[PDB]
Amino acid sequence: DRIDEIERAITKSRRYQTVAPATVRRLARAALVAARGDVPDAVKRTKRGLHEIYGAFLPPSPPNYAALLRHLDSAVDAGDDEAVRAALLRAMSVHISTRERLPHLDEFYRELFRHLPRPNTLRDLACGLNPLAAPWMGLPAETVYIASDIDARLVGFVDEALTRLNVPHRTNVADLLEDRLDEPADVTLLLKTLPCLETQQRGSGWEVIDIVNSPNIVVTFPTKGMFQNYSQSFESQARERSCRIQRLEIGNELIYVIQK
Ligand SMILES: Nc1ncnc2c1ncn2[C@@H]1O[C@H](CSCC[C@H](N)C(=O)O)[C@@H](O)[C@H]1O
C-alpha cells in the first residue's frame, strides 16, 4: 500500500503526473527502503530522483505542446518546409538536453549516417524531443521510426509530430531499466542517456548496449573534464569487450558508433 501511496503523491500535479507508472514504482520501491519506511521521506526521495533523471530536462509544469503542435500544423498546412523546420527547432528546444544539439543538427546527422547503413527501422531510446529532428536525418522514405521515453505526454507529443511529418513510426513509454529491448531494429540511438542510467543503476549502461537487439548502436555523451571522464570510462569498457567503435565529436557531444 505504501508504494501506491507514494505513487498517488507522485501523480505530482505539474512535473510528474504522466511519468511512466513503471518508473514511478521502481523509484518509489528504492526510496521506501532507503527512507526506512517513511512515506513522506520516500516521496521526497522519489521526487528528487525523478528530477535527476527527468524533471531537470523539462519545465516546472508540462510544456505547452498544444501551441507547439499548432505551429507545426500551420507550417505543414502552408506547405512551407522552412516554417516546418523552424517549428520543429522551437519545439525541440523545450527539452533542455535536446536543445543542446540544435546548433549542430545538420552536421550531427549528416556525419552520423555516413557511418551507418541505410536503416529499415530506427529506434530512439530515452528519445527526449530528438525524433522531431529527422527531416535532418535523410532517412529512407520507408524507414520506421521507433521512439520511446519515460513520459507519456512527451512521447504522445513525439507521436503527433511524427504523424504531421508523415514519418512511419511507433511510439511507447518504456523504462530502459525494465522494458524489453528484443524487438529488431537496424539502428538504435542512445543519445546522452548512459550517464543518467548509470546514476539510476550502476552498470545498466553497458547492460543495455549488450541486450539491445540492434547491430548498430549510437551512444553519445554530453561534453558541456567531462569529455575526459566519459571517453576514458566508455573506451576502457569497450576495449574490455573488444567492441568495434568509431569515435566522433560534434558540437558539445562525444559520439560512439558501435557495430555488432
Ligand atoms: N530509465 C529510463 N528509461 C528511458 N528513458 C529515460 C530513463 N531515465 C531517464 N530517461 C530519459 O533520458 C533522457 C535524457 S536527456 C537526452 C534526451 C535525448 N536522448 C537527446 O539526445 O536529446 C530524458 O528524456 C529522460 O526522460
Q: What technique solved it?
A: X-ray
Q: Which domain holds residue 47?
A: 1-57
Strands of the sheet containing 187-190, edge to edge, are 169-173, 145-149, 122-124, 187-190, 216-222, 253-259, 244-250
Domain end position, chosen among 57, 80, 100: 57
- What number does the ligand 1 atom closest to the CA of 190 have? 19
* 113 and 19 both lie in a single domain: no
* 64 and 170 both lie in a single domain: yes
* 3 and 118 both lie in a single domain: no
C-beta 57 within 6 A of ligand 1: yes
Total domain count, the chain: 2
Ligand 1 centroid, distance to 77 Cα (angstroms): 31
Identify the CATH number of the domain in which residue 48 sits: 1.10.8.10
Distance between CA 14 and CA 176 in Å, rounded?
23
* 106 and 36 both lie in a single domain: no
Ligand 1 centroid, distance to 59 Cα (angstroms): 15
SS3 19: strand
SS3 247: strand
* 245 and 256 both lie in a single domain: yes
* 136 and 113 both lie in a single domain: yes
* 200 and 253 both lie in a single domain: yes
Identify the CATH number of the domain in which residue 132 sits: 3.40.50.150
- What number does the ligand 1 atom closest to the CA of 220 have? 21
In angstroms, what CA-CA distances link 52 with 46, 58, 88, 96, 140? Answer: 10, 11, 26, 13, 36
Tell which one of 123, 130, 150, 254 to mutate to probe ligand 1, the residue whose CB is within 8 A of the most ligand atoms.
150
* 19 and 81 both lie in a single domain: no
- What number does the ligand 1 atom closest to the CA of 92 have? 22
Ligand 1 centroid, distance to 13 Cα (angstroms): 21
Distance between CA 15 and CA 120 in Å, rounded?
35
Return the amino acid letter for 213.
N
Q: C-alpha angle with apex 234: 181 to 99, nearest 5 degrees?
A: 70
Helices assigned H by DSSP within the chain: 2-10, 21-34, 39-53, 65-77, 81-92, 96-99, 105-112, 152-164, 194-200, 204-211, 226-239
92: which 3 cell numbers?
525541440
C-beta 175 within 6 A of ligand 1: yes
Indicate the annotated binding residues for S-adenosyl-L-methionine.
Answer: 95-101, 126, 149, 175-176, 191, 200
Deposited resolution, Å: 2.1
Cβ atoms within 10 Å, residue 189 = 23
Residue of the nearest CA to atom 2 in ligand 1? 175
